[PDB]
Structures are given as structure tokens and as C-alpha cells.
Symmetry: D2
Subunit: 391 residues, 4 copies
């Protein structure tokens, strides 16, 4: 083999896949990065050679988006991947493809609020029955499955309570029951957990959070384990017109190269911050998979690779008013906003951004979600200490 | 005392002024004449109490650049509001997802855009929604087919690719009398030639990919709503389905929309000349263009078309499918053999051999797509080069 | 006849003007068929071997880039030159000209009412290199003939001039410089190739600020040097690599998009400008109007000989009442007008050089370069001309 | 620590630590919208509200200044520890602006003889035509710089580490010498990055950066930066950048603002991988010499540990046994994940041989005078798994 070739029998290791996976220099010019195909249509050789070069119209497929999809499928370990404008678009495409009137769908009751509301308020009007259950015990999944059940939709770790779901056990249950297991691994990243290695049928990802990790783009990704699922997803994406654009795909191809080192820094910072918070006299409870008080420490040790993530949560003593004061006084470098998984550490209120339906979802009084970034951990802890001084 | 930066109080801007400036003012912070690109996911909040005080939180729900474009588009189309989407298909599917439910009936023109038709029949009907495809050239047919289950009447004019016209005013009168939502896709028309919201339509769907862009650069869609209620439901469902337009695409479209009037004027003058040339060419059987006397709906065209008759035309070659294939395989530069329309670059397509090549012949003659039908999207090149290329190609058929 | 197929031009085809603006120097992407050139937003290019170094034509984006190269071939075709080199700004292009073709002890003739950037560039920077710049009247070519020295290497003309709209006979000056064997460089930013191509008229080098009409949307900055011979082009290319002022791929993509509508943009701008100049010429508050399309124009013979299709989107006038009247007018110019510094855009722009850009310079020099006290520069856009005239009328009512 | 600041403010008197500055320096949420990232002002001109309020909002024309570029410039000035900074289309543009602003006919300028080939070519092929004398000397000894200073000397242009021999220059001693002799000190710290060495901290007057390499670190954009220690130097550079029309674009500034946030962790990973790779290469039968500041064989190890912070860098060099032919064989058989190209400092590992690619048309004596031997290989270590990089290098050396 010569320059530009991978060694025969090569299995690139993880970080190599994040830097190089599924992307090669441009054949025409040798450009080390994939050029941006900011372009609607593609000229055909003739009528008989329609699609001979692989492209026709950017709503159906785009070369930059295709390069990103190949990289994403390689990173998550699936057959194929389809990229979308947003993570909600990926979720909605899954629900549109695999649910018909009369079908049943099991969802984790602490899913992302957008997923829950899109199921509850929109798709329910098509006479699809969504049942929200506790995924912490896989036996609940096994006993709630009906003959009409098509999709089991898990999420691990959960937004924002950080509950874990045993992806391997749930997937075994679903294979025995012949139902599609879809897993939302946005909080974990493939660097900490790949549900496809654990038997899941589909992975859904909001690339907005960690794939980007720069507060730059929006994006979604559906990673399919087989060709049939992938082809159904691709067809429906073309039908619904929610494909990701070439510029976003270029941004994400760039940002994905640093996901491992970013997540390593974020999870080290998060470990230190969780320990600090767990020894703080104004903090009632701290949720982080890496500290011994984590209720699902056994599952986290079984399921998490490399790290325990940049996401944590905590409750301030005194409830809603103390939490609101603290968040109103959290100083820079923190940012009080709605995203997560970025270089910029973010602090959020889930509720104030009915308590009867929220206390059942785990978001109790004074629940604070923390997305740790890559700043100096001491500056972050200084800001947190000052903010807690106002609680 | 009107000063620099203000509009004169009682002076409504005219059309081209609206296309250049509509709904976009210089950046308050810096004075930037173009609004900056908010290539940015999230927006910092001043406090928990002052949530959304500056109007933004998350770009999937709303983005400042996208919002500027939406204000310009709503101004140009003459509606209350607008929501911009990643594609035109996204906008159409958002309409269908918002206003249809199992058991409802929806009327669509049988010569709709292929994507609209395929989206209805292969996806939404699995939700037990009945889509009936009737001929919209006679509004009394729409008046007949409306039932108590009917919720949406989906018209298109001019139609892709047959350029059939629908009388938006008469159809809107019908739907208003019958209390049913009239949605019109005027992508082929552009707001410069026809504004369905002026003609009584309740919703307009646009694929900004075509003429709003006009440069083969971006994908995009738009839903322009006549009332606050329709706009609010479209906005909510767009946030739910995550198919909003990107900020970079919105910037591109804000740039290209400024030249839509002159672009469409050049394209339509070129198209008139090309249609006349084709109509007096011996290897051409039929020519379809609203601006030549042989157009079957000349009365409606003169009634509801403004300024121009469009850059789209169509024609049939003598000898049918094989002759059309030969000709299209021999259409030289400056022409492009591809799938888009409405761009500065002139484009030749065969919907029977490219878009509906997998479709059977028996049902493609019902869409009016004869085999040998050729869709022409005229660009802004010198019309003599375009005619020379067409003549060379026709010599091969 | 022939047997060319789709994607081919007819044999020996010479595209007409507008066709060159839409398609010139750009073919679909050979790899994918993409109708537009993809953006090569990347720094370095991988080589397949030591032997095949540069075999695919690219190594490093500072030296050259595929998107920039597409734009450069298009611009060379549009201006009718051998080659083109694209730069980050128009001033970058001009500075590269001056850096390449002047040395200590050399003489260079510049039009006295040149653009302020070129004048400042020569007087405040390059003069330090013992290059002697002389600023003369270019409205009479015999002035150019009489000012040429044995040490002269460059004659830098500009037509129409920024902002006086003075013209220069590019053909006669080109004849003079050919006779005495000195390089003729011409800045035709204000004209655009759609109105005047100096290389057609015997110029050796054309300099363009693509920021203005090439862009025409107030979006990007950019410059271009178009060379009539391979030797000049190679010198410019080498120095552009040395100085690191190449245009970026994103800017090149923007300009490739915007250039496609320059003909229709300029047609609309010039029709609007003709109507606006005719309106202002009759105006109570207006002292003079300067536009090549009205009989008032002093150099109308040269304009009719030298201008193709249009007389441009630029005009200028003088408000009666001096600097205070100018200031009142500017302070009350309403939308759709904009009070700013660019020109050639779809958005109509208006400004007064004496109180904004040239406020620091002494009145004697302003009058020396023809910029009177009430001088107003007007870049006409593509808005409805009636709204523009209404705005001008109100602003003048406050004068 | 008893104050009353709230969300959006820094703590009073706060000086953030290094990584915090890389993420947040020079940048705050957008006042209009709260946008956490600076919007891209893809925009030429800026409307003025009045004749009297001209420039009251800070901007007029993007060739002179642009808000995105200014945000990046503030971040860079904070990161390098300087008064001000101006950003340019390329690094060569930054260097060219320095040479244009501070040199006149008859002036003398000392340049490190192993400077980046572009700077050397810039000096000899273009600026020397203005009767500016450029003398190229060995900067590894500050006494050489002091003895080589002439009455007409105005600029001393150091580089450390130098492209590509990785020679070091004692920035602090050279700065002391220049400050005594009242001469400008410009330092090209492109290879080092501010994360490893900040020459303004060590007394330099001007820092020149190619943001193309490590600031970007993604093979994405070109750019340059001039960081000035005083307002006077900064104003001179600003004025001349407006004259030269070589300012950075807003889009490039946005890209670089994005990528600068990960420079610390990127450089940490790159330098750890580079330490391992240099050891593995110090260790090979086909390798004659390895040059990396982090291994004991480095000739300037003492200066390296005095001057370098946190890391020893992602750049290394070595020389294969067997000269140009073995070097060519290895280069022709360097497999993925390596790339054979001309940039450096990126996430993608890059390898090249200057004597056969960029300096191939250069005389051999001229190359050996700069220390570019026949088997000389320049290695830019990325952030891939170091074992894959080592396997690729081992396969390539097997075919040498
Ligand atoms: C944010 C999020 C989503 C939605 O992705 P978007 O890009 O915002 O549409 C889905 N799932 C999870 C777990 C998320 O955190
Ligand atoms: C092309 C087209 C569409 C689809 O719009 P996209 O932007 O391609 O998704 C819808 N309607 C009509 C009339 C069209 O021509
Ligand atoms: C504006 C202008 C220039 C300078 O070009 P920039 O892109 O602004 O640097 C040069 N010449 C003329 C005639 C101009 O109008
Ligand atoms: C690459 C480089 C430069 C030139 O910077 P560009 O961005 O390529 O113009 C200058 N100095 C050093 C040390 C370099 O490595």
C-alpha cells in the first residue's frame, strides 16, 4: 500500500475514527477536507445515465451530508446514517416511519421534553397509543409490551434527570418480542455508549449537543443497524424534506474531530464539580454517574465507557425560590441558556424555562441541570460557589 | 421631522423597493446594512423571570436571521405571517400535519407537484386521510367535491410541469362559502406574478428553492399565513417537527430575493421569445406558455397574472419519447440537463424520463405528462444562445 | 454540422455577454455534476506521491484555491484578459500592482481625482520607497503624454473617477503608453466590464474592486487584477503568493453567485440613475448634476464613445447652500436610502465625501480634486425609482 | 468575594484562568439577542445615523474593521497578553504588514537564518528591492544577535521554534538586548502557540501568528495575526492594514473564534502523541536523528524547559537513514491516517519532506546551511490514536 491507503486488515482505533472515519481527500483536487456542496441540483450526463454520479437533488442527498453520514455510521457502529436539520426532525421521522394508526409505542417517561410533547400532542392524533413508563427496570418494558407495540423508545442518560436504561437488557427483550428498539443516546455520545453495540435497532442523535459541542449548529442523525431500516428512513427523509444542509454538515464534520478530547475534558471537570457540589452545605442532592451516591452506579459501571459525561444535576436546599436566586446570580464563565454539551458551560432550569405532571418526571423543586464545558474547573467552581452564596 | 433611517409616514413602498428592503432594517447595534448571520444555537437569558425578554432562546424554535427573512416574505406575499422551512416539501408536509387528521378529506389538484402527490398518497393516507385528486381548471369541480369531512383544498398554479392554471379567486370564494381551508402552492408563479393571499387564499406554500433563491444555491420552504391563528399553529408545529430553515440559508435567501423582480423579468422576456421560436419550429408539436396565443387558459392567465407570464414553459417534440430523449441528450451549453427550476441557469428536464421514469405510462398521461413532454426553465442568459442551443438539439430529434 | 452532446458547448461557440456572466469559466463539478462550484473551504491538498507533486494543481490555499480559480477564469473571460488574480480587497489588488511594478527611483503617473484609497496608498506608503508619484489631469490625454518621464513605469488611470465621475480616454492613453512603452493600469470599478472593458481599449492591466458592482449586494469585500499577457499575470500571481492577500474561497463563491446578475442589476441601476439625474437637474436646491447620461455632462462625447449599454449607477450632484445644506440633506435622507460608504449595490446609497470620508483633509485639496463643499455621491440601487425620488425630494426640502 | 453581581457579569476583579480565556476571551453574548456566539457580520458597510454621529457605533467599512474580526482580535490580544491585535487574510500578510510598516530604504533588519521559508523569501525576493538590508544570522546565541546589530538596524525578527528545524531562540535574552539597543523585536511564535510560549510575556515588542496552523487546527481557514504590546505599534499596524487591504474576513474570524476554544486540549493531545512518537522514532533502526524539544537528545533542552509551558508541542522532525531516496520511499508509502501535504498544526496528522517538496528546487548547500538535511522529515502530529500513527510510521519506515 502507498500514501492515501489504509493498511490491509486495518481497524482504526476510536479517536482515529473521530478524526478520519468515512472521509477521504477530495478525488478531484486532493483537498484534505470535504468541499462544501452549496448547491441545489446536479447535472446529468444523459437520460440513460441518470444518477450515474450519485446525486440529483440536494433534498434527497448531498455529497457533504453523505460524507458526514458515513462518518457518523462508522462512529456509532451501524449500517447507515441519515442526517436531519434537527434532532427533533430525526425523532419525528422515526415516529412517522414506524408507527401507523392502531400501533403501540413505549417511551421512557423521563424522555426529552420535545420528544414527549411531540408524541403526546401531535402523533397521538393519528390514533397511535403512547405509553410512558419507567425504563430503569427492564422488566417494566418486558411486561408493558403489547401485540400492537412497534417501537420501544429508550433514552440514556435521560434529559434532565440522568436516569439510565439498560440498553442490552431492553434490546434482548425487544428482540425476543420482535419490536424495534430505538435509543436516544444524545446525553451519552458514542464515546461513552454506543447502543448499536448493545443490540439496539436504531440510534437517534441530536448532533446539536455534543457532535457540534460549539453552540454552532442544529442537527439530527438516525443511525440504522440494517439496510432495510436505513432505506425506510432515507425514503421518508426525502418525502418529508427535513434533510440537513451542506453547510451544517461541514460544520459538524469539523467539530466531530474533537469530540473525544472535548468529552474527556468536560467529564473530568464534571467529576470535580459533582464532588464539590456533593460536599456543599446548600446542595440537597447531586446526580452524576461518577460519584458514589449515583442511584444506578452498577448500571453506569456496566454501560459507560471512558467517562461518565459532562452532564450533572443538583437540587438546592430551600426549593424553587433558592434555586431561582442561585441561577439568577450564576456568573460568567457560566451561561444561563437552553443548550447543552458545548465548550461553554451552561446552567438551566427545566421547569421555569404544572408541578403535578413535573414532579412525576423527576424535576422536583429547585432542580438544576448543568452542562459542563472545557473552561478551567476552578473558575466554574468559583462561579458556582458565588451563586450558591445567594441561595 | 423624519430623519435618516426612517420611512416617510404616509408612503407605502412599491414592489421592487419591498423586494430590496422589505422587513429588514440596519442592525441596531452596529448599523450593518445587512442583518448579521446568527450562526448560533442558543441565546443567553438575563434572568429566570426575564425569560425570552429579547425574543429568542433556541434556534429550532426561532432564529433572528430566519425571522428577518420571514418578515420580508410575509410582506412580499401580503399575509399576516410566515414560517420558513428547510425545504418546500417540509412546508407542505407541515401544512398536511397541522390541518389533517384521520377521517378528514383533502382535495388536491391532480397535476400537483410530484412530491406533494407522493407525500400525500404514500405517507399521510396511512393515517386514514383520504386525498382526492380532481381537475382544478374548472372551479365548479372543487365546489362539487367538497364534503363535510373536507378540511383542505390544495391548489397549484401554474402547475408543475403542465402549467395548468387554477382560478384562485373563484376557488377561494367557494372555500370561504364552504368554510374549508384553501392552501395554494404558487412556487411557479412567484409573488411578482401572482399573490394568492390577495386572491382570497388562506395559506400560501412556497418552495424558496426555485425563484426566491433563483441561483441553484439553497433549499428552502415557506408557509405564508393570512391570519394570526393559522400562523400560530404553523409556528407551533414547526417547532415540534424540527424542520425550520437554517440561518445561513436565510441569509442567502435574503440576499437573492432582492433581485427577484429583475430576474423574473429577464426570464419571462427570454421565455416569451423562446416560446414563440418553438411554436414556429417544425419539429415541435405543442408549446405551452401563458404568454403565447395558443395557451388554453389565456383568459385566466391575463386575469390573474401580473407583470409577466413566467420563466417556465413546456413543449412536445414530434416523434414522442425517443425524439425527446435524443433532443435532451443533445441540448448543449449554456443549457443544463438537471432537476431544478427558476434559476439564473437555463434548465431542461423530462418529467417522464427523470422524475416519473419509474411511473407507468397509463397514469402519466392523466397528469398531462405526455411522453415527450419537456419542461423548460428559462434563465437570464442571452436568449440568442438559448435559442441556438435549442435549435441544435431539435436538429437531433 | 457537429456531434456534441449535453454538457458541451457548440464547436467554436462564442457566448454572448449575459451568457458569459451566467456561465463564464464555470462547468459543473466533474465528480458529482454539481451545477455550482463547491466551496473549497480547506487549507491544504493531499499529494498522491513525491513524483506527482502538484499533479492535481493544488497544494496550499494561500497560493491558489479551486473556487478562487473558477472565479478568476470567469473574471478573465468577462474582462477579456489573459488571466485574473483575486485578492481580499480592491486595495489589495492595487497595492499588489504598485508592489510588483514599481521600484525606488521609478516614476508613476496617477489621475489626480483617483479613488481616495489609491491616492492615500501612494502618498502615505509607497512614496517612502523613493517612488515618485505625480497626480495630473487625465481628462486630456496630451497631459499624460507630456508628463511621461524616462523613469516612468506605470500610468494609473481611472474612469469614471471616484467620486467626480471624470472620464479618461482609455484608448488614447493606451496608445500613448504603448508608444513610450510604459505599463497602463486602469481602475474600471465604477464602470464594470458591462459598460467598459479597458483591456479591449489597449490597457495592460485592469484593477477591480469586486466589493462594489461584482458583489452588488453589500455582502463581501474583494479585488481582482486582470492581465492582458502571461508575463504580467505571472508576476502578479507570484507576488500575491508572497504577500498573502489572496481572496478566500467563501468570498469567491459569493462573488461567483452575485456576478451572474450584474447585467440586469446594472441595467436597472442605470435606468433609475438616468431618471434620478433628470429629476435632480431640474431641482431648485440642486446646483449641478454630474451624470454621463444627461446633456449636462461635460465629457459627453467621450462617454458616448467609451460607454456600452448604459451610463452607470453612479451619479453626483451639488446642493445649493454649501456644507451645512449638505449636512441637513444627509441628516434627513429617508429610507429606502441608506447613509453609508459603499456603492454599486441593490440598496441605494448616498453620502457626502466632504463631511464623512474626506472631513480630515483641507478645503484647498478637496477643491483641487473637484470635491466641492456641497458634493453628494449617489450610488443608485434597484428600488422603485419613484420611492428614491420621493426620498431625495424630502431630503432636499430640508436642505 | 462579597459583591452583588448577577448572571451575565464576571466576578469583580476576576482574571480568568487560561482555558477559560480560550473559551470566552474577548467575547460576550450579543447585547441585542443574547446569542451566545458572536453573529457573523457578512457585511461590507454600516449605516450612519447622522453626520454628527459618524462612527458613533464603531464601524463604517469592513476593509477597515468588522465586528466579528474585532471580537476575534480582542480574544487574541487577551490570549497572547498584548495591548492590541489585528487579524489578516494570511500569516504571510501579517509578516508583510510588519515589514511594510517598520522598514524603509537603507534600514537593516536581522532575521533568524532558519526562519520560515515564506518569511525568508518575502525578505529576499521582494522587500530587499527597496534597498532594505536583510541579514540572516544564527539566533540560537543571543550574543550573535547583539554583535550583529548595526547602526541602521530597526527590526530583529526571531522565530521559535523555527519552521522546520525546531531551533529555539531565547526570546527573553534577545528582548533584553533589543530593548537596550532600542530596536523592535518581532517574534513568530506560530509553532509554539500562546499555550506553550507567549513572547510578549518575555519582552517582545510584536508577535506574529499564522492562525492558519494551530489557532485553526482544522485545515479549514487561512489567517494571520499581529499582536502589539503598545498602542502606538498597534495603531501603526491598524492604519497600514487599512491601506494594504489585507484584513481577515468575517467568516474566517467566526471559524477561528470557534476553533480557538479547543486549542488547549488539542495541543495537549497533540504534544502527548508527539512525545510518544518522538520516543518511538528516537528508537528506530531506520532513523538517524529525531528533533523534538521533549526528548533528552534535543540540543537546546535547557532553553526548551526554561521557555516552554505545559507541553513541548505537536511538531517534530526526524531524518531517515539513506538520504533523499529513502525519504522519498517512506513519503510514498506513508499510509492513512497520515496525510502527505503542506500544512501543520491540525487535528489530522500530516507528514512532509521539505527537501523534495517545497525546497526541491533549492540548492543542496543552501538547504544544509539551514539544517534541512537530505533525509529530513517534518511531522505535524494530530489527535488520532497514537498507536495508529505509530503503526503507519513503522510501515512507512519498513519500505524506506
Ligand atoms: C435536545 C435533544 C433533542 C432534540 O434535538 P434538537 O436538535 O434540539 O431538535 C432530542 N433528544 C435529546 C436527549 C435532546 O437533549
Ligand atoms: C420543487 C417544488 C416543491 C418542493 O420544494 P423543495 O424545496 O424542492 O422541497 C413543491 N412545490 C412545487 C410547485 C415545486 O416546484
Ligand atoms: C472602493 C474602491 C476601491 C477600493 O476597493 P476596496 O474593495 O474597498 O478595498 C478602489 N477603487 C475604486 C474606484 C473604488 O471605488
Ligand atoms: C505557515 C507559516 C507562516 C505563514 O502563514 P500563512 O497562513 O501560510 O500565510 C508563517 N510563519 C510560520 C512559522 C509558518 O509555519
Amino acid at each position: 500500500v502507498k500514501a492515501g491507503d489504509w493498511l490491509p486488515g486495518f481497524t482504526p482505533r476510536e479517536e482515529t475514527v473521530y478524526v478520519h472515519g468515512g472521509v477521504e481527500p477530495d478525488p478531484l483536487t486532493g483537498a484534505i477536507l470535504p468541499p462544501i456542496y452549496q448547491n441545489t441540483t446536479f447535472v446529468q450526463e444523459s437520460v440513460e445515465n441518470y444518477l450515474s454520479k450519485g446525486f440529483s437533488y440536494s433534498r434527497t442527498s448531498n455529497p457533504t451530508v453523505l460524507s458526514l453520514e458515513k462518518k457518523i455510521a462508522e462512529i456509532e457502529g451501524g449500517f447507515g446514517a441519515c442526517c436531519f436539520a434537527t434532532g427533533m426532525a430525526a425523532t419525528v421521522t422515526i415516529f412517522s416511519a414506524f408507527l401507523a394508526p392502531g400501533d403501540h409505542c413505549l417511551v421512557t417517561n423521563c424522555s426529552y421534553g420535545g420528544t414527549n410533547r411531540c408524541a403526546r400532542l401531535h402523533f397521538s392524533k393519528y390514533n397511535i397509543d403512547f405509553e410512558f413508563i419507567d425504563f430503569r427496570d427492564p422488566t417494566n418494558v418486558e411486561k408493558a409490551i403489547r401485540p400492537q407495540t412497534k417501537v420501544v423508545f429508550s433514552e440514556s442518560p435521560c434529559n434532565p434527570t440522568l436516569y439510565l436504561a439498560d440498553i442490552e437488557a431492553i434490546s434482548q427483550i425487544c428482540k425476543e418480542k420482535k419490536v424495534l428498539h430505538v435509543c436516544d443516546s444524545t446525553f451519552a455520545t458514542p464515546y461513552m455508549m454506543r447502543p448499536l453495540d448493545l443490540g439496539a435497532d436504531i440510534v437517534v442523535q441530536s448532533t446539536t449537543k455534543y457532535y457540534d459541542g460549539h453552540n454552532c449548529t442544529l442537527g439530527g442523525a438516525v443511525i440504522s443497524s440494517t439496510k432495510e431500516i436505513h432505506d425506510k428512513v432515507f425514503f421518508l427523509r426525502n418525502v418529508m424534506g427535513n434533510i440537513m444542509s451542506a453547510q451544517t454538515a461541514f460544520y459538524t464534520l469539523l467539530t466531530l474531530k474533537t469530540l473525544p478530547i472535548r468529552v474527556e475534558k468536560q467529564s473530568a471537570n464534571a467529576q470535580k464539580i459533582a464532588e464539590f457540589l456533593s460536599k456543599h452545605h446548600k446542595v440537597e442532592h447531586v446526580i452524576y454517574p461518577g460519584i458514589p451516591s449515583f442511584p444506578q452506579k452498577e448500571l453506569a459501571l456496566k454501560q459507560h465507557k471512558n467517562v461518565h459525561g459532562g452532564m450533572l444535576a443538583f437540587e438546592v436546599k430551600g426549593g424553587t425560590e433558592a434555586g431561582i436566586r442561585m441561577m439568577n446570580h450564576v456568573p460568567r464563565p457560566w451561561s444561563l441558556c437552553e443548550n447543552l454539551g458545548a465548550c461553554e458551560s451552561i446552567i438551566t432550569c427545566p421547569a421555569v424555562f404544572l408541578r403535578e405532571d413535573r414532579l412525576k418526571v423527576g424535576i422536583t423543586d429547585g432542580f438544576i441541570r448543568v452542562s459542563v464545558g472545557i473552561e478551567d474547573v476552578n473558575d466554574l467552581i468559583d462561579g458556582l460557589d458565588y451563586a450558591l452564596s445567594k441561595a
